[PDB]
Amino acid sequence: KVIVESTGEAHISSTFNNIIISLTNKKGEVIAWSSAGKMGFRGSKKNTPYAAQMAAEDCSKVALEAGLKKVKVYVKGPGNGRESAIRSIHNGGIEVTEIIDVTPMPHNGCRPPKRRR
Amino acid sequence: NHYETVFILNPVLSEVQVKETVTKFEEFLTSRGAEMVSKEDWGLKKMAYEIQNKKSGFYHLFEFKVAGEVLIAFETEFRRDERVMRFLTVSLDKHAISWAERRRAKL
Amino acid sequence: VRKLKPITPGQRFRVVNGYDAITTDKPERSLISPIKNSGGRNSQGKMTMRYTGGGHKQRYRIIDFKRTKDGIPATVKSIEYDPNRTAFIALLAYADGEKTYIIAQNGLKVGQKLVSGPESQPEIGNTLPLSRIPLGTVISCIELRPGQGAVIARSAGTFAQLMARDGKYATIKMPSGETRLILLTCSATIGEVSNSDHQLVVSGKAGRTRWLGRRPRTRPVAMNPVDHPMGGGEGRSSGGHPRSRNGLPAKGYRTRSKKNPSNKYIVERRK
Amino acid sequence: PSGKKRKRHKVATHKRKKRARANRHKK
Amino acid sequence: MYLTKEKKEEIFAQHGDAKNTGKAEGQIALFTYRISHLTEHLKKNRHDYNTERSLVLLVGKRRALLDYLKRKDINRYREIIKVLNIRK
Amino acid sequence: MLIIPINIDRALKRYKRKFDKTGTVRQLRARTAFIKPSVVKRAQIQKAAYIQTLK
Amino acid sequence: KYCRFKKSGIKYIDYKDADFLLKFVNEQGKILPRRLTGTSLKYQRKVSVAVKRARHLALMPYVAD
RNA sequence: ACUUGAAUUACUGGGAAGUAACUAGAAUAUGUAGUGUAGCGGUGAAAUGCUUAGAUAUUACAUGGAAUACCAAUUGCGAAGGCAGGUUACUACCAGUUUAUUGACGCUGAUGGACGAAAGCGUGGGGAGCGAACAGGAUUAGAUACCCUGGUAGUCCACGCCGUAAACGAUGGAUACUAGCUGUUGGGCGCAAGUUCAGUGGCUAAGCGAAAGUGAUAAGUAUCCCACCUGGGGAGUACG
RNA sequence: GUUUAUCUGAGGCCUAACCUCGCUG
Numbered sequence: 001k002v003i004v005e006s007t008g009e010a011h012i013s014s015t016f017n018n019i020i021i022s023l024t025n026k027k028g029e030v031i032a033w034s035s036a037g038k039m040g041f042r043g044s045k046k047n048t049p050y051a052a053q054m055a056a057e058d059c060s061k062v063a064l065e066a067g068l069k070k071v072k073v074y075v076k077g078p079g080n081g082r083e084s085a086i087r088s089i090h091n092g093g094i095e096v097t098e099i100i101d102v103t104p105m106p107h108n109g110c111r112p113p114k115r116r117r
Numbered sequence: 118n119h120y121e122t123v124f125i126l127n128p129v130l131s132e133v134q135v136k137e138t139v140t141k142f143e144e145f146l147t148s149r150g151a152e153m154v155s156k157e158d159w160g161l162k163k164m165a166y167e168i169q170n171k172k173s174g175f176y177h178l179f180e181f182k183v184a185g186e187v188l189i190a191f192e193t194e195f196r197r198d199e200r201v202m203r204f205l206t207v208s209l210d211k212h213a214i215s216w217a218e219r220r221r222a223k224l
Numbered sequence: 225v226r227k228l229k230p231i232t233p234g235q236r237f238r239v240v241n242g243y244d245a246i247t248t249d250k251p252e253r254s255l256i257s258p259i260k261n262s263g264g265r266n267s268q269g270k271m272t273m274r275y276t277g278g279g280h281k282q283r284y285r286i287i288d289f290k291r292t293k294d295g296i297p298a299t300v301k302s303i304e305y306d307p308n309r310t311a312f313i314a315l316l317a318y319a320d321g322e323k324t325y326i327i328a329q330n331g332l333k334v335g336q337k338l339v340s341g342p343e344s345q346p347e348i349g350n351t352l353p354l355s356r357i358p359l360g361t362v363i364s365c366i367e368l369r370p371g372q373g374a375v376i377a378r379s380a381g382t383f384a385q386l387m388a389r390d391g392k393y394a395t396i397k398m399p400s401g402e403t404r405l406i407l408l409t410c411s412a413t414i415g416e417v418s419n420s421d422h423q424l425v426v427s428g429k430a431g432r433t434r435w436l437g438r439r440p441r442t443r444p445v446a447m448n449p450v451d452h453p454m455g456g457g458e459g460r461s462s463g464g465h466p467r468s469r470n471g472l473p474a475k476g477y478r479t480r481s482k483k484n485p486s487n488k489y490i491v492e493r494r495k
Numbered sequence: 496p497s498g499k500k501r502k503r504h505k506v507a508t509h510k511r512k513k514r515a516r517a518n519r520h521k522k
Numbered sequence: 523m524y525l526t527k528e529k530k531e532e533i534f535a536q537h538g539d540a541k542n543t544g545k546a547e548g549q550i551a552l553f554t555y556r557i558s559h560l561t562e563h564l565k566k567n568r569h570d571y572n573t574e575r576s577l578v579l580l581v582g583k584r585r586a587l588l589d590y591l592k593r594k595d596i597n598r599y600r601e602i603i604k605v606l607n608i609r610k
Numbered sequence: 611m612l613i614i615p616i617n618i619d620r621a622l623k624r625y626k627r628k629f630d631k632t633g634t635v636r637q638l639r640a641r642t643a644f645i646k647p648s649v650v651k652r653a654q655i656q657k658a659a660y661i662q663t664l665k
Numbered sequence: 666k667y668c669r670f671k672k673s674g675i676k677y678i679d680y681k682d683a684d685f686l687l688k689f690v691n692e693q694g695k696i697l698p699r700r701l702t703g704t705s706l707k708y709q710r711k712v713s714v715a716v717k718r719a720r721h722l723a724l725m726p727y728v729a730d
Numbered sequence: 731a732c733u734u735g736a737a738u739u740a741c742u743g744g745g746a747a748g749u750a751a752c753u754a755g756a757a758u759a760u761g762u763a764g765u766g767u768a769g770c771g772g773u774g775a776a777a778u779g780c781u782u783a784g785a786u787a788u789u790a791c792a793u794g795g796a797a798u799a800c801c802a803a804u805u806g807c808g809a810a811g812g813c814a815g816g817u818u819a820c821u822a823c824c825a826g827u828u829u830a831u832u833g834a835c836g837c838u839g840a841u842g843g844a845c846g847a848a849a850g851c852g853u854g855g856g857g858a859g860c861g862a863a864c865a866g867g868a869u870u871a872g873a874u875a876c877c878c879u880g881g882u883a884g885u886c887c888a889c890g891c892c893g894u895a896a897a898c899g900a901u902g903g904a905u906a907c908u909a910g911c912u913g914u915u916g917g918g919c920g921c922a923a924g925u926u927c928a929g930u931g932g933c934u935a936a937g938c939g940a941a942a943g944u945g946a947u948a949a950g951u952a953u954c955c956c957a958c959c960u961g962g963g964g965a966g967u968a969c970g
Numbered sequence: 971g972u973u974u975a976u977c978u979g980a981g982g983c984c985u986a987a988c989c990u991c992g993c994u995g
Contacts, residue, residue, distance in 0.1 A: 001765080001766090002764090002765050002766075009788090011787070011788060013786095013787070013788090016642075017771080017772070017773085018770080018771080018786095020770090020786070020787055021787095022766090022787050022788060024765080024766095024787090024788055024789085025765075025788095025789095027764085027765085027789070028764075028765075028788055028789025028790075029764065029765035029766080029788080029789075030765050030766050030767095030787065030788050030789090031765080031766080032766080032767095033766070033767075033768095033786090033787060033788090035768090035769075035770085035786080035787090037769070037770075037771095038767095038768070038769065043775080044773085044774085044775075074788095078634075078635065078638050078639075082626075082629075083622060083626055086618075086622060087618070087619070087622060090618040091618070096616065096618065097616055098613060098614065098615070098616065099612075099614045099616070099621065099622070099625040100611055100612060100613045100614070100730075101611065101612035101614075101625070101629060102611055102612075103612075103634060103638075104756075104757060104758095105634070105637065105638070105641075105756075105757075105799065106641070106756060106757035106758075106797090106798095106799075107755070107756045107757070107797085107798060107799040107800090107815085108756090108757090108797050108798045108799060108815095109756065109757040109758065109796080109797065109798080109799090109858095109859085110757065110758050110759095110796075110797075110858075110859045110860080111644060111796085111797080111859055111860045111861095111885095112641055112642060112643055112644040112859090112860085113643075113644065113859080113860060113861090114643075114644060114860070114861075115643035115644045115645065116643065116876095116877080117876060117877085120818090123681070123722060125722075125723070164723040165683075165720075165723050165724060165725055165726035165727075165729075166723060166726050166727060166728075166755080168723060168754095170790095170791090174723075178681075185818075185819060185820095186819085188818060188819070189751075189752090189818080189819075192751090192752065192753095192817090192818075193752085195752095196752075196753080197346065197358045198358075199358065199359075203721075203722065203723060203753090203754085204753090205718065205721060205722050205753090205816085205817070206817065206818070207718070207817065207818090208817090208818075212676040212677045213677045213679075215677075216677045216679060220679075290992095369990090369991055369992080370991085370992075371991080371992045371993080372991065372992065387793095388792090423854085424853090424854095485989090507965085507966095508966095511966095511967085523821075523822095524820090524821090527739090527740080530738095530739075531739095534738095534739085539831085541739090541830065541831070542738095542739095542830090542831055542832075543738050543739035543740090543830070543831050543832090544737075544738050544739075544830085544831035544832035544833085545738085545831075545832055546737095546738095546832065546833095546835075548738080548739095548831095548832090549737075549738055549832085552738080552739095560821075560822095563749095563820065563821065564821095566749090566750085566820085567748090567749045567750070567820075567821080568749090569748090569749060569750090570748060570749045570750095570820090570821075570822090571748080571749095571844080571845060572747065572748035572749080572808085572821080572822060572823090573748070573749080573820095573821055573822055574844080574845085575809085575822090575844075575845075576821085576822050576823075577822095578843090578844075583737080586737090586835070586836095587737085587835070589835085590834090590835040591835085593835085594835080611693075611728060611729075611730035612693075612730055613730045632693065637799090641799095644860080654803075654804075655804060657804095658803080658804050658931090659804075659931095659932090662804080662913095662931080662932055662933095663932080663933095665912095665932085689801090690800090691800070693800090694800085695799085695800040695801080696800050696801040696802095697800085697801080698800085698801070698802080699801080705915095706803095706805065706806085706914095706915070706916095707744085707745095707915085707916080709801070710745090710801085710806095712801085713800090713801045713802090714801095714816080716800095716801080717754095717801085717815065717816060718816070718817090720754080720755080720815090720816090721753080721754055721755085721815085721816055721817090723754095727754090727755050727756065728755085728756070
């Protein structure tokens with residue numbers, strides 16, 4: 001139902017325990033998503049370059065057969081896999097044109113939760 | 118003392134509305150006992166970020182002189198007008214008045 | 225707000241209002257109408273709305289809630305006490321010669337000349353339409369229908385706030401916390417209502433409740449099963465699920481009609 | 496200095512505090 | 523306590539010798555002026571302990587000068603307190 | 611933001627090293643937990659003293 | 666490693682010059698430490714408040730790149 | 731009688747120094763609308779928890795609360811507690827110097843007054859995040875804890891109440907002397923070098939100290955005033 | 971698999987039945 005015009009983005013939101021890739025149209029409508037935990041990697045290996053590569057390649061040649069050729073990847077959050085989440089999209093067809101990083105950082109906004117012992 | 122206010126207007130206004138708002142703002146000071154020095158209109162400039170989903174605005178500078186006892190009503194009749202989007206009023210002294218003069222004398 | 229000394233047991237915890245904003249004690253003779261009180265008895269004579277008796281007969285002062293004299297400035301002449309409401313009145317005298325009894329605001333003193341209409345300034349006391357009250361102002365006496373009067377925020381110490389404006393309606397936060405839409409042509413008065421120190425008044429006495437017009441209220445728990453569905457029982461007993469008199473649950477049960485034709489104007493309930 | 500000297504003053508001030516807490520609401 | 527050069531010159535000339543800015547009488551007059559013009563600000567800024575303490579310090583300085591006058595010349599002390607309405 | 615124009619591995623390494631240089635790989639691990647001023651004010655008097663004794 | 670304001674005769678820091686206020690800001694729109702520019706503390710405070718005033722007046726961006 | 735102490739005045743400046751009122755952005759949370767399907771979150775590994783009633787993810791808008799990344803620090807101010815987004819109003823204080831002015835007007839200070847972190851108490855609002863107590867999951871022989879998922883008071887605001895801290899430089903306030911080296915803050919004299927006051931760090935000589943250490947901002951040599959100490963426990967306990 | 975004339979399930983809009991308010995229609 002969503003238009004798949006050949007200009008889009010890939011939001012790669014990583015963290016300390018997982019990573020989520022979402023290939024999205026140029027208007028915010030998500031086309032195809034994937035996750036390390038979705039690609040049968042439940043455990044302490046969700047935050048790994050191999051898991052990120054598999055999660056990226058899962059949706060790469062899924063959104064590829066939809067009409068997407070050029071991507072404007074937006075990377076967010078810390079954690080491993082930001083490298084081999086763009087590596088195994090640009091090496092799997094669809095071409096990347098930007099590596100914009102949009103990691104949010106508060107300007108002393110909220111109280112961090114109770115430093116852990 | 119010596120004050121200087123700079124404010125931005127809504128870019129959807131016309132040339133007749135942006136010329137009917139600045140005069141209503143300037144007649145507010147000349148009625149309380151002020152002396153307008155240099156009223157400048159930079160024009161339709163672009164904003165670094167987006168304000169009210171807009172990325173442009175008409176800038177204006179007043180740079181007036183009036184006692185500080187009539188500076189609260191002047192501030193309320195800035196946030197009670199819906200045509201403005203941002204305003205800033207700062208005081209000047211014998212280190213900024215000279216710079217203002219020498220930069221106004223530089224075209 | 226004064227705190228009486230504990231001389232008597234009926235005076236230990238009594239707190240008397242200060243009435244510091246009141247100036248004149250004698251009202252205006254031409255703006256007073258006769259009024260009699262009822263003990264809840266309706267026209268036919270049956271006692272509906274029980275627990276209201278009678279005490280200290282009062283007189284009614286004709287309050288001007290419309291304020292449809294636009295462009296004519298009026299000066300405050302005196303701030304007086306009205307027994308028929310909770311807020312002070314503060315009689316006004318117009319420039320042409322009329323005298324009215326509009327309701328007073330929080331910062332309304334004797335000597336202020338206030339103007340009505342749409343071309344007035346958003347100052348305390350002045351009344352303006354919602355299409356010209358700028359934004360987020362603490363307003364009161366909001367009209368619910370154009371040209372009818374004042375309905376919302378009329379008690380001592382209440383106020384509302386403007387939220388937004390969308391073409392024909394403006395969003396307003398009623399004193400109860402309900403967010404609702406009101407036509408833009410409706411009027412309102414800037415500034416909070418008077419008294420504002422009414423919630424701090426303590427009686428410390430059963431006699432003041434009867435001075436005000438109330439009567440003692442018997443608990444249905446200390447009754448017989450023929451009088452209330454909650455009475456009866458050997459010894460001190462409860463009443464099961466609290467009903468009112470006809471089995472209507474009295475805890476959580478909402479009585480607002482779910483098919484109310486005015487449901488298209490409510491944004492939050494908070495009631 | 497050493498911590499053993501400052502010690503036992505935590506226990507002496509905790510036992511009294513707990514006793515005063517457990518002896519409240521007595522009347 | 524908005525004190526200008528002209529106001530100080532006037533409050534010193536009122537006691538005499540406007541160029542004599544060190545006389546105990548002129549100093550006590552200045553202290554009384556800027557204490558009376560500060561206790562009023564303390565009525566709208568009742569939570570301004572920073573200026574309350576400065577007012578207390580000014581009172582202490584004025585009391586020190588009054589004690590100096592009392593110990594040196596008994597007549598000038600009575601004259602100044604009667605003309606300035608001090609000491610209760 | 612960290613917009614970086616554009617082989618792919620060269621640009622990816624450039625982006626990764628710019629991300630490591632702009633001081634963020636360790637900026638979020640410090641905000642994950644809460645450090646009160648009483649403990650954030652001693653890591654300065656114990657660091658400046660070390661830098662001074664290292665001179 | 667000197668102060669460009671103490672070497673010259675500049676005593677004020679204007680905030681209406683977005684082109685001039687770009688010499689004390691990072692490539693991503695952050696105030697540069699005075700260690701890299703040699704500016705004294707008295708003028709570093711002024712240039713910081715001027716950068717903040719320009720940010721408020723929307724002449725310099727908060728989040729840039 | 732005098733000006734050196736002290737205070738006032740004049741000129742240059744200095745700051746997160748106070749009280750009140752406005753205003754900005756990032757981020758978190760919630761709601762609406764669009765896209766979309768099976769996970770999300772968490773740990774040393776798991777589970778509780780949210781999810782096919784459409785979550786996590788993404789776009790746009792709106793609402794609300796708290797705190798202000800970079801500047802930013804053995805910086806600076808304040809008697810101390812403490813003070814950090816920006817603007818204005820009302821104040822206060824400090825430093826230097828060509829002035830002019832009074833002439834010991836000074837120091838300390840028992841009773842006493844004022845201020846006084848956080849937590850706590852009363853009344854009325856607000857409540858985004860955090861989170862005492864508490865409820866589940868996990869570890870353990872047990873776990874009334876550490877760990878994980880929720881969460882009330884509280885944290886916030888307007889008036890008040892108590893007056894306690896490792897309220898620490900574990901070093902009371904003054905004045906006067908006694909070697910240097912090396913940064914930095916705000917002034918003066920300087921075309922630069924550099925010099926002189928007022929604050930703030932480090933090394934160290936003599937001198938002190940039981941030693942660790944201190945060392946011109948003394949724990950060095952003197953004088954004045956205040957508070958406190960006299961083995962450990964009982965005990966900051968009993969009584970008033 | 972679509973088109974043309976009807977029935978029905980739902981939304982949106984209009985005023986012209988029906989309801990309400992302000993000045994006196």
